Structure formats: structure tokens, C-alpha cells
Amino acid sequence: PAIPVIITAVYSVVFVVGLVGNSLVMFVIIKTATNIYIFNLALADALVTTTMPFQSTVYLMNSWPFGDVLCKIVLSIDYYNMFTSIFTLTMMSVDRYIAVCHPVKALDFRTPLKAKIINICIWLLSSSVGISAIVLGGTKVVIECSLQWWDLFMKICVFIFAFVIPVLIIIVCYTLMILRLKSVRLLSGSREKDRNLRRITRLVLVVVAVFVVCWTPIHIFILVEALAALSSYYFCIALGYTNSSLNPILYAFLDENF
């Protein structure tokens, strides 16, 4: 009843927006830790958003009209880049918390070499999930491309190390950063300074709110499918794509150093 038209037009719009944003970002980068994290988030968002056809065609024709090399490589890329983007957001939050609440030692900790080391470690901890995906990648018999209590344990593990710990770190680091910037001088008892503090608070609450409302329903749907049809699942996947589409805007266009 006209569901499948709009719900793939939104996928086309999301793919176009994500490609345009990821092409616009990193162009001026081609020296700071924030720039390295922004570039890594851009790469993760690009390789997430590039996975439109392998699910749009699946929802179009209920089969897997691609080879079994795809049903391994695409899933490995999906898991790898999802974990990479999530952990890069987490490390950006921790970097901001160190820069504000621990100012004397943020001079030494927030070295670009240290940021590169942390990014490489994030790459390795996502490559572990990529290897776990590439090992178990196998089709079944319509043609359903998936992985063959191990499924329940895998879903519990990805929920634990992909949603709750990053969102808890986001919440804690940003609330301590805001509570410190409220008591700091140069932002107390004025108009423009209070405007800048309110702008910081608005941007922080925007990024946390978009993360929770735009990464939560997909995780909830996967965990309830584990221990009018499938439209909600495909919409949850749509929001999962919109998160990777929207993160480069919120971390590049709203940053004054870009």
C-alpha cells in the first residue's frame, strides 16, 4: 500500500546525502587530534553509507541476487565500519572531557601521535569483529544472506560493546564537561559568554539525542527479533543509515575549526 516506494526513496536520499557530506568533509584535510578523529569518522561513515544496494535490493526482491563473496565481504565491511564509527564517537567524547576537565595533562595526552595510536587501536578492535564476521559469513536456503545459542551470544555482545558502553561514556563525559564549563570563569555573568555556553550545551544535547534516537530502534529491533511485516525493520535500518549520514555534518559543519 505504497510503503515500498517512499521507504526506498528515503534510502536513495540518505545515500546521496551521505556521499555528498563525506565528499565535502576531509577535502580541507587532504595537526590536531580532533581533525584525525573527524577524518576517521568520515571514513567510517562513507564505508557505512556505501552499503545501499546490498539491502535495498534485498528488500526489493526477497532473495540474495549477489554472489556468496558479497555475503561475506559486505557483512564484514558493515560490522567493521559500524564499530569503527561508534568507537570514534566515543573517543571524541573522551578527548573533549580530557581537554576540559583535566586541562593541565590534556597538553600531554592530546598529542596527535597519541590520537593516531588510539585510532589504530580502534581499527584493530573493529578488525576483530570484521574477522569474526568474515569467518561465519554464509548463505542459507528463499536466499537469505545471514550468519550460520551462538547467535544470541553474538547479539548480546554486539549490544554490550556497541551501544550501552559508548552511550554511557558519551553521557558521563559530556555531563562532566558541561558541569565544569558552568563553574569556569569567562563564561559566567555575561551575555555573549552565556550564549556560547548555551550553544555548547545545545550542540552536546543534539549529538547525544541524535545518537540515542537514531541508533536505538535498530538495536532494540534486533534484540526483540532475537530471544505491516518487516517495514519497521527496514525503517530501523533506515535510521541506522541516517546516523552515519548525519554524523559528518554535526562533527564538521558545526565545528569552528572547519
Next chain:
Amino acid sequence: ELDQLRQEAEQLKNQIRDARKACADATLSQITNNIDPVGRIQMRTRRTLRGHLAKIYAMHWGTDSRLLVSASQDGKLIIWDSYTTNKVHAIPLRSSWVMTCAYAPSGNYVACGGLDNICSIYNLKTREGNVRVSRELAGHTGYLSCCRFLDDNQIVTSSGDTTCALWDIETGQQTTTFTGHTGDVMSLSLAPDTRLFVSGACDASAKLWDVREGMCRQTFTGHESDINAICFFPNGNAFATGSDDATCRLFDLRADQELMTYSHDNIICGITSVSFSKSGRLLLAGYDDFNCNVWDALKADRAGVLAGHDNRVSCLGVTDDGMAVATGSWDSFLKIWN
């Protein structure tokens, strides 16, 4: 008879002005409107030098026109190979507020100085493989603003105590003190025969001095602000001044008055460094507007603009052979232009 002395000084100044006006019979623009313009000379950054981590305040070229010495605010004096970008030496300074640096013509010594009121002479050629402090010349009262070598044993310095000084390096003693300025002396330049030298001060004046006599021959007053830079013409019978009033001025020593002014309405910024080219046709002036300008000395038309520095250009120098112009700014970067 203080009023009588003041009247006598006023009469002497009026006589000097009358003689200077009587010497003027044809402006240099009238005799220079016939020559062809130099065009639109564009220089590119052939080299860049990285390694300084603070604001660069001084540089000096060598006689070989390949070795360079640069002084920065991190207490660092770096000797560079201009051709290969290699750093020959990284001398750590006792005081980090260095405002001037010089390179000996023989190439064995480098001088530095600044807010410590001491001219430090460093020996580069040692039996040990290190650069050692050879001398610490002291006796100036204010900050050391410019130092220039005459030989391996003599050096002339300028300071903020309104005096210039001549030092015998071996004895380390005040050979001659040059007196007569009112404001802070900001820069020095030495004649090619190393017998006369000119100093520009903050009293909107420049003075010519004999090295071997310790007396001021001529005083030139055309500007209206603090003169920050000074340089002889390659002839040695003229010099150029730059000041905070966004105006350069070329004086001639025998005519004893100003010959040309270089200014533009669009240029409203101070001048930090002025030097000439090998033939004297081309004048190069660094400004506070984050880039350098290139004037024609015989006709005050802005021939070129050297741009690419992200901060104020603090120093600039021209090689002896004239094949490179090196600029140092506050962005901790040096650039060689050709």
C-alpha cells in the same frame, strides 16, 4: 643665555633647511619618468624551512649565500643549509628574547642579542664538534636591536639606550660610543667599504657615523613615526628607511636630503624590514599586513607582492649574489623566494 642658544640652534636649522632647498632643483621623478618600468616580477617560494617552534624575529645571510642563521623566540638560533633545507646547527641561547642576529663575513662566528642587553658571539669552528660561546659583550643599557660585523674582531651594535657602540671582540671593551639620537635606535646598516654606517631611530631620524672617528656627519629627518628598518644602497652613497607610517624613504648622503618616498593609500601598516637588490633597482619591504612588497627604487610603483606568510613578516634578507630573498615571519617559518 638658554634662549640665545635655542635661537642659535633654530638659526642653524633654518640655514640647513635653506641649503637643502637650494640643492633641490629637479625631483627624481622628472629624471626617472623616461626609463622603462620593471613590470610585474613574481617570485615563488623555492624553499621552505621548518623547525622553529616560535616567532622568528631575525635572520642574516652569509657571504657564501648558502648558509643562513635564524633566531626565534624559543631560545633557538638555527644555522640552515638553504639549498638542501638541512639544519647545520641548533644553538640553544641563554636568553630566549632574541631580536637580532648576525653572521660573520668569514663565517666562523654568529652574533645574537636582545632583551638581555648582551651581544653573544658564538664560535662555529671548534676542535670539539660543538658550537661554544666565544664572547658576551656587555655595556649597553637598553635592549640590543641590531648587530653587524665589520671583521672577526670588531662589531657594531645598536640599542634602546639611544646609542650605537663599537666593540673589539677580543678585549670585549667599548671602543667607541655613538651618541646623538633621541629615541630608541632600531636598526643598523654598514657601508660596503665598512667605514661609515647609518642608524635609524624612533625619533623619526637617521644618522650617518664614521666608524674610525666616532662622530655624526649627517642627520636626515623626513619621516613622522618610528623608523624600524634601514639599508644602504649598493652604491654606498644612499640609503632607505621604513617606518610605522606605511612609508619608505630613499635618502642620498651627498645631497643631504630625501630623494624619494614610497607609499600607497591602500597600504596602512607598519614596516618591519627593508633591503635592496644587487643592482639597487629593486627595494623589498616587509609589512605588518602578513606579506611583503616589492617597490622599484627609481620610480615609486609597487612592482610586486610576495605573499604566503600566515603571520607578520618580521625579517627579510637578500643574498650577496642576489639569487634569493629569504623572509621570516611570526608563523615559525622561513621561506626562500626567487
Next chain:
Amino acid sequence: VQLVESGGGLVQPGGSRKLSCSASGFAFSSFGMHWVRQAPEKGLEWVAYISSGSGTIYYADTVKGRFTISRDDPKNTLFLQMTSLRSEDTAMYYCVRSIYYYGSSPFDFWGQGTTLTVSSSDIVMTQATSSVPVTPGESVSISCRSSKSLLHSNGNTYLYWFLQRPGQSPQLLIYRMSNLASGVPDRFSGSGSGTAFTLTISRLEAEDVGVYYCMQHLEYPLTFGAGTKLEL
């Protein structure tokens, strides 16, 4: 400046030994350090080189796989560990300092050397003349030949001249041609191009008798030449 070498002695074939050299009087950490060798009745031969900070290590072909070169900068010491010695290693070992930049003076100081006795491609530097007579107050010209042109594209010509006096460590006279080393009287001059090279002594004295050695520094393994001996 002192480079005092210790070690050496009589070692049976197949044995091992460690040569040390103590540096006293200069910034040891900023000098690249070379081990050079002389057979008892023959010329000079390069053995090994260690860079400043031990970044670059180079060996000769003969000592490769048997010899180890190292340095202790806080201890101001240089080390050569020798394993599996043959009877062709019976020689005197000198330790040389060399600082490297355009206008510097590499190979400008040499050590005394230690004697090792054992019981039981490459640029060839040729000095055809040997054992030429001299008369005090005269002018002596010493020739030197190569196999590859030593003039680089940067204008630098890498020929080094050394003087081994009787019973004394080699000195340095000219490091690049027409560049005269410190402490050398202004009667030594050097001139040449490509393959051909000449050293000129305008008015020799009694302190200028010895053997004159060539060296190329264009590329490793830094081959010397069989010297010319001056005889009164």
C-alpha cells in the same frame, strides 16, 4: 682530542676478541666513527663505520658476518667485536672520527691503534708511483688515479689526502681538494678532476717525510690507495 685504543694481542685462528677505543676531549655523540686497518707491511683498509646515534651501520665485505661495530655514547667508547678470526686479520687497527656536513672535515683525527696477531663494484684508487726521492726545499707532486669520476652533481669532489709519518698515526691534509685541513701549513695544495688527482708540496721540510694516502668518499666501502713513500 684523544682516541686511545685498547685490546689486541695474540689470538688463535677461529677465536674472538673485543677492541675498545676511549674518546676524551670532544663531543663523541656527534661524530660518526670508523674502524680502519693496516696490514703490517701494507697500506690502509676500511673495516667498519657507525653513524652518530647508531642509525646507519656499514661494514667491509671481508669483515661482513664476523665483525660487529657498536658505540657507548655515555661511556664515550667505541667497540669492535671480532669472531672467527683468520690469519689475514693480523693488523693494526685505528679508530677515526668524522663529522658530516658540507664544509666539515671528516677523517680529521686518528687514533694510535692496536696490534692484532693471529698464528698460522668498488672504486679502485691507484697510485702507481712509490718510493720517490726528495730533496729539502724542493717541490714534490704526488699523483693519484681512480676508476670512477669523484665529482658529484653538487660540485663536491670527494678525494681525501692523508700522511702516515714513520711510526705515527695518519694525519689529514686535504679533505676535499683545495680545502686545507686545520693545523696544516699553507704549502700543501690539491687539484684534480674526475679520475686524475694531484697533491703539491711547494717547499717540503724534514717534518714532511712519510707515506701519502688517497681516499674516496663518494660511495662505500671507502677504498684507499697504496701510498707514495717520500725518501730523503
Next chain:
Amino acid sequence: ARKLVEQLKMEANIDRIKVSKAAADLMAYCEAHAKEDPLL
């Protein structure tokens, strides 16, 4: 003020050539070495 008036008297009694002669000297020096200037 004695030093000031002495310096002014020494500066006044100075041989000053015509300005056109100085300008012509500058043109002569510039034109005599223009071929040896590698910046223009």
C-alpha cells in the same frame, strides 16, 4: 646645548652636491649592474 649647537654647526658646514647629480649617479649605478641582477 653646546654639544647640540656644535653638532648643528658641523652639519651645516658640509659640501652638498646638486640633487640631480645624486639621482644621475643612482641611474648610472642601476644601469651599470642591471644585467647582474637576477631578481628583476
Next chain:
Amino acid sequence: VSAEDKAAAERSKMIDKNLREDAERDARTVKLLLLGASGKATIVKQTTGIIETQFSFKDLHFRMFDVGSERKKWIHCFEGVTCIIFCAALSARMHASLKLFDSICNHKYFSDTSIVLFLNKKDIFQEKVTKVHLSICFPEYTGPNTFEDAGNYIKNQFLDLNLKKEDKEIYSHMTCSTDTQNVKFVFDAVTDIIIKENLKDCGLF
């Protein structure tokens, strides 16, 4: 490339490493500039030129520089310092201090440079306030002879003298005698500037 040129490049890389490690060691230092008319010697640890006072507090190294007209000639050297500690005597002279603060707090290079202002000689001002009224130099007070009120009034025409009070901040502190109080105040100030610099570097601010 020649062997000598390769070794020269290696030497240049070693100089690069030493420069980098020196920068890493010196990055934990705070640039403080001490100015005043009048108790400059009462704040140091509570023709020569500069005087460098180095002191450490809570893992920060601080370097105060004493430079004690035409002060604009050398003022470009301190165009990137962290803070300016200004000294002023309540029991001072006052016109000269106001003129110096005019020249300093509205300077071109110090539009975004924070000022820590000390009002020293508090006991002397307490003794002097009851004796001499405020009309000796500022005949507009018309207020009580209380020491606290007099100090609060003299704090104005110093703190209210600045312009563009949205970018930089001026901190006020009567000079105490409890040893580790003024250094802790300067520590808190430079912590505020360091937090602002970290916010700007991270780019969210």
C-alpha cells in the same frame, strides 16, 4: 645523493628529534609577564635586562619575566604569552598606574590576553584610608572610610577601565600573606586560559 649528504641529512633528522623532545619538555610551561609601577618584588615567590623567575605549582611550570618610556618597541616579544600579572598599590602614582593599565589592557597584542591584577599593600592602605580621604586623587568617591569599601572603589577605574570585556578577563585579588594563595590564584587563572585554549583547539567552542 652522496654519502656525506646522506649523513648530513641524518644529522638534520637528529636535530629534528632533539627539537621535538625539547618542545615536548617545554610544552608544560606557562608564559607570565609581570608589570607594575608597584610591588613587583613582593610577588616573586611571594641595565641587566630581563629577570626570569621560574616556579612550579600543581604540575605547571610558570615563568614570570620582569622587564623593569617607549615600551611599544619590545612589546611584540610578549604577543603570545598566557597571562599578564599587573601590580598596583592601593596605598600609592595612581594616575601613572591608570595610564600604564590604559597602555596595557587596550593594547593591540593584548586584546585577548588575560590580566591578573594584584592590589597590594593592604595593611598600608588600611592605615592610610582612615587618615587621608579618597579626594586626594579621585574627588568623586563621597563614600565611607571603611577599608573594604575603599578597596572596592579603588578596584574600579582599574577593572572598569578596560574595553571589550567579552573576550579577555581581568582577575582581582588583594595580595594575601598566607604564602600559597597568590600562586594558587594565578594557577586557577592559567587553568581558565588553558581550558579556553583546549576548547578552541578541539573546535567545539
